[PDB]
Amino acid sequence: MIREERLLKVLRAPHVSEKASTAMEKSNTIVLKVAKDATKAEIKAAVQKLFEVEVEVVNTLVVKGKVKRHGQRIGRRSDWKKAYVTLKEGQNL
Amino acid sequence: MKRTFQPSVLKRNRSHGFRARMATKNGRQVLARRRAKGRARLTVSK
Amino acid sequence: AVVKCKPTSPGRRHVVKVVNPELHKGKPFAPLLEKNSKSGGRNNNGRITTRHIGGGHKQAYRIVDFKRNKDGIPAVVERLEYDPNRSANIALVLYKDGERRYILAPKGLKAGDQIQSGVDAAIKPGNTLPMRNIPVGSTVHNVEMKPGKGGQLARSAGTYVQIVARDGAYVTLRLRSGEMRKVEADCRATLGEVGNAEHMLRVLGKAGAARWRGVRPTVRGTAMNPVDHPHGGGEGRNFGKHPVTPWGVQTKGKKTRSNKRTDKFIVRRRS
RNA sequence: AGGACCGAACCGACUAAUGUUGAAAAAUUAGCGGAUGACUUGUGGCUGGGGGUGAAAGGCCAAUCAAACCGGGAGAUAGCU
RNA sequence: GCUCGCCGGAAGACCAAGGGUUCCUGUCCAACGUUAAUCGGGGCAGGGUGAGUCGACCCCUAAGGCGAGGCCGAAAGGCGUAGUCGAUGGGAAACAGGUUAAUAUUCCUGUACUUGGUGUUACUGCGAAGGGGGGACGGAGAAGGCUAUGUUGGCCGGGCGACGGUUGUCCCGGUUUAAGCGUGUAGGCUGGUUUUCCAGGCAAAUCCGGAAAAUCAAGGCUGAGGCGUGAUGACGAGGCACUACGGUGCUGAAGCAACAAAUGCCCUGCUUCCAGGAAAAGCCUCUAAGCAUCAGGUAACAUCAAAUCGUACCCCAAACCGACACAGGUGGUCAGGUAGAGAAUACCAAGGCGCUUGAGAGAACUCGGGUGAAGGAACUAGGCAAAAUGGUGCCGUAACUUCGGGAGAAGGCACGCUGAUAUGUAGGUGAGGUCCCUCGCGGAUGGAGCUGAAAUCAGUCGAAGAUACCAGCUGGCUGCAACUGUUUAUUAAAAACACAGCACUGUGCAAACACGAAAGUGGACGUAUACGGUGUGACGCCUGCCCGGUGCCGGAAGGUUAAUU
């Protein structure tokens, strides 16, 4: 049993993009920025508990951060985890 | 024309990596020297 | 037999091979097989300590019975087999209790022959007895030097030792080298010579044939530079030196043995 | 069968020309040798400097080798310029 | 956009290594790009990488590393046992179709499979750090059976041609479908079953090994492909309509056969040879202690679980190694057509490119090529370079020889196309049909259809038929090295080195010898038919005299002679 504190820390935000919108409109898949150390089980539990929707499956990828330049100085943005959460055909999250 | 540098990350790490340096007493001296100099990169590990 | 190869190529012109139709043509006995990897002549420091070693065919080690300790139990020679690890052939033998072993095949040994070990064994080839029980003047092989240690002398193909004398707890043996040695009469020996006496009649014929056996080329010292060998140097073909080893010791006639620990067992040196 | 023969891949490098502030700090073009073997190649490992390794040319050991490179003795010494 | 040219065993496609956002979209043209730039692998912003089955991780080990105690060493340290790491090797499981600007065996649709945990049923002797099996292994060669694949025919849809002809033996295109599940074939291996006993397998064993009988003469293991199902499905020409003209919605006919055929599969097979060809786990099996009406095992069912990390992109290259958007280097996989022995070569397909300065002119001279009167090595250090030869079949072929060679010696003849033999022959394959049976993936007969050399005769065109690309120049004397091989990466490839063979010599095993203050290690899990050093260098005929000098070996009387006292 994953604790509510862990569930509350797991999910960072929703991901807004053309691919995410198409996923939602065609497959009932919500795309979320989640924590790096979040597992599929933790994401499923957090989504079910906090969004009150039933989850079918969770797919996750780690997005590596881009190397950018600011005023001719070199920095790197952080890696982050993206989750594709498939809902159970009638949840409408 | 084959050049003298043929990269391989495994061989790089096994020859000059942090654990390779820490294995021996002279590698730990290399690490101490680089820490004293103030190097931003201690080893080839990263 | 000893067969000459027809000269269909310069590498075949001078090849003489020893072919035994009676050697086993299948795989060896698996339970008695062990792995032995090559070394290249390099010791645990990684340095070349013996020169001209490297490459050759992969070989498996056959666990050969040099002790011959199953006393009183008869064994039948299941078959004769090629051993890559020695110049002699081995014989797979089966004991009356169902144990299989490898021994050196002696001259005349053949499938179906019966062999035995112990004081009560008969005096016939392939039988192992203490040299105290073997009659004097006999030809034996695979002779032990310390009782129970296992045979160490006369183990090459065609080799044998002659029991010359017997004085109390000791037997004097004439060795293949021509040496007379003292060995405890309680040490074991097998009767007969080691088979495969035609092994010395083979001619490799080409350099690749020597390379197949793990031998690497031998560069003469005269062909080196003064920094490489004591023999190196010269504008043309010059020697002007007494021959020496790569490390400076005279190499034509100078004696190198020094063992006062075992000098007492040498009745007479080989000459 | 064969360190067999002819000949691509593959390995090498005998001749000529070009290039020689090069396309290239060793190549290109046309020819050339081996091409089932003492062959060739990937990955990993081991041998360390008066040391290694060398089918031996003082060859090779990171474009460096009759003693690698890096730091130190060190501002060596220089009756020489 | 239309033409033209180039690659096409690549200059196409997919990866590993390496790189790391170079990927896609929008926007800008300062700098970068050897020119311009509206374009870019450039700047900026946004987006993009979805897995129980692919890979890693993971279990198992090789070489090798580290290494509790331990042994050794002034110190630092060296070695190493039990162990533990270490792939480049062994170990469970997914396919087809669809889809994005950018991911897909990951998403969707359809259809699968594997391992484990729990719970319910039944039947039950389970149990390891131990035993056995298996995993599990070389080179070469030969052939058969197949398939990927291609070609042609049949079938279906469309067409009737810018210029003579083209309703035909005419033209174009398509004719595709996986894993899984079932069956069990060509082939390969092996005699099955039972009983009794046993010095072997660190003890037991019903297991493996061995001994002795009885009985049955077909049982078992492995195995490509084919066939059925998967699939009333998917895909499918072109059509019925859209397009913000980059791309999209709906329908969808045929969807077969014969022949040819891999270097891929049966095949870790078979034959043969000597140089005699990993390990450990997973896996099958046997038990010991132990537990023993519990655990545990086997089968069925239901349910749960399969985490984590990689996944974009380049990858023979403008993204990797070369300071460069650099004529260099870089491992694996795929392998269409015509001709061809061919993965050579020429021309093409799919696919990808025209190589990031152009425009003119048409001097000398330089570079790379083409042709050349008469002569033909007169050139030059030297035939350097060039020219020349070049294929197949057949005839023919010398000295010398180690009898294998020399030899493709040398030299010569034929070679296109058309018709006939024979509207396509010999050969290969081989349907329907017939017939039989230990009824199947069967046997015998048969020859339809497909494919198809080579030869002879006759004719015929050209200057020329191996017409292009491709593709030995030949002969004679002689030095050196026997030969194949190796060598101065980057001016020397040789006559140098190596070599098989020969000889001398040391070495009796705790070997000589070598690396090590040592412990240890190699030699070698070898044992004088072995190993080390040295010289010579296939083979044939041989290898003469000298021991005075220097070395080595033996001797041990006498002389001299250290520490010691």
Ligand SMILES: NCC[C@H](O)C(=O)N[C@@H]1C[C@H](N)[C@@H](O[C@H]2O[C@H](CN)CC[C@H]2N)[C@H](O)[C@H]1O[C@H]1O[C@H](CO)[C@@H](O)[C@H](N)[C@H]1O
């Ligand atoms: N609705 C369409 C047209 C129709 O099907 C048709 O024309 N059939 C002819 C029949 C005609 N009989 C065929 O001749 C050939 O075999 C004949 C033997 N039966 C001999 C002559 C030979 N040219 C002709 O090859 C064949 O051509 C057609 O089918 C061929 C089969 O693949 C295709 O290659 C070809 N593309 C296609 O046009």
Ligand SMILES: NCC[C@H](O)C(=O)N[C@@H]1C[C@H](N)[C@@H](O[C@H]2O[C@H](CN)CC[C@H]2N)[C@H](O)[C@H]1O[C@H]1O[C@H](CO)[C@@H](O)[C@H](N)[C@H]1O
């Ligand atoms: N591939 C051509 C290569 C070249 O032209 C060649 O070497 N030719 C040889 C010559 C050589 N001199 C010929 O001996 C023949 O006549 C000799 C006349 N006395 C006698 C021996 C006899 N074998 C030899 O028959 C002949 O072999 C050729 O032809 C053979 C037959 O078709 C083929 O098997 C063989 N593949 C082929 O090489």
Ligand SMILES: [Mg+2]
């Ligand atoms: Mg999923």
Ligand SMILES: [Mg+2]
């Ligand atoms: Mg993932």
Ligand SMILES: [Mg+2]
């Ligand atoms: Mg660096």
Ligand SMILES: [Mg+2]
């Ligand atoms: Mg030697």
Ligand SMILES: [Mg+2]
């Ligand atoms: Mg030699």
Ligand SMILES: [Mg+2]
């Ligand atoms: Mg020598």
Ligand SMILES: [Mg+2]
């Ligand atoms: Mg030497």
Ligand SMILES: [Mg+2]
């Ligand atoms: Mg020299």
Ligand SMILES: [Mg+2]
């Ligand atoms: Mg010297």
Ligand SMILES: [Mg+2]
């Ligand atoms: Mg001279």
Ligand SMILES: [Mg+2]
């Ligand atoms: Mg050859």
Ligand SMILES: [Mg+2]
């Ligand atoms: Mg040749």
Ligand SMILES: [Mg+2]
């Ligand atoms: Mg050739």
Ligand SMILES: [Mg+2]
């Ligand atoms: Mg050269």
